[PDB]
């Protein structure tokens, strides 16, 4: 499905430090780091996707462990875990033990909190979401003319908010 692949791509964007993620309507998923390294994300199975670069065929694998739980493992073995706690709340856990909890505050506002107390907020508008912390990191999601995400930095809670937004958009991001 498109939703699994979108979630896998956002998780890989964190694990590989992507600065940009582009998903086209035909399904191509490309991640770019701030210095220009490219990765591709491909669905191999229901609930299985891999991240490929030109030098390394499989740098990370994402697996749907359960209907509410997704796991991404890099080649070197570090793990990034997505746990949907409720239709409006999820938990993101990295292999170093940091966590971020994201939740819907109101129809157009979402908020996330990390382990050390940092907070971020997402503001939704038709065709777009704008994510900002007090820590100054920003991210933008555009799904109006399939989806693009631009990251100023790689924060765990910004990623958790993007994952919650993707989970709530469903098929609204198909084209």
Residue 141 · residue 148 · CB < 8 Å: yes
Query: For residue 37, which phi and psi values (nearest 5 degrees)?
Result: -65, 135
| Sequence ranges of the domains in the chain | 2-173
**Resolution stated for this PDB structure, in Å:** 2.0
The CATH number of 2-173, from 2.40.160, 1.10.3470, 3.30.460, 2.60.40, is 2.40.160
Q: Report the structure determination method.
A: X-ray
């Amino acid at each position: 499905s498109l939703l699994f692949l979108r979630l896998a791509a956002l998780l890989a964007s964190y694990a590989l430090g992507a600065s940009k993620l582009v998903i086209k309507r035909d399904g191509t998923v490309t991640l770019t780091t701030k210095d220009g390294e490219k990765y591709t994300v491909s669905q191999l199975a229901p609930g299985v996707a891999v991240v490929t670069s030109e030098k390394e065929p499989v740098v990370a694998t994402a697996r749907q462990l359960a209907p509410d739980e997704l796991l991404l493992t890099t080649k070197d073995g570090r793990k990034l875990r997505l746990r949907r706690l409720a239709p409006d709340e999820l938990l993101l856990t990295s292999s170093d033990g940091q966590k971020a909890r994201a939740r819907v505050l109101d129809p157009d506002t979402l908020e996330a909190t990390s382990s050390d107390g940092q907070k971020a907020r997402a503001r939704l508008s038709p065709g777009k979401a704008e994510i900002e912390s007090e820590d100054g990191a920003k991210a933008t999601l555009r799904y109006d003319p399939k989806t693009e995400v631009e990251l100023d930095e790689s924060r765990l809670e910004i990623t958790a908010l993007l994952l919650l937004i993707a989970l709530r958009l469903g098929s609204l991001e198909s084209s």
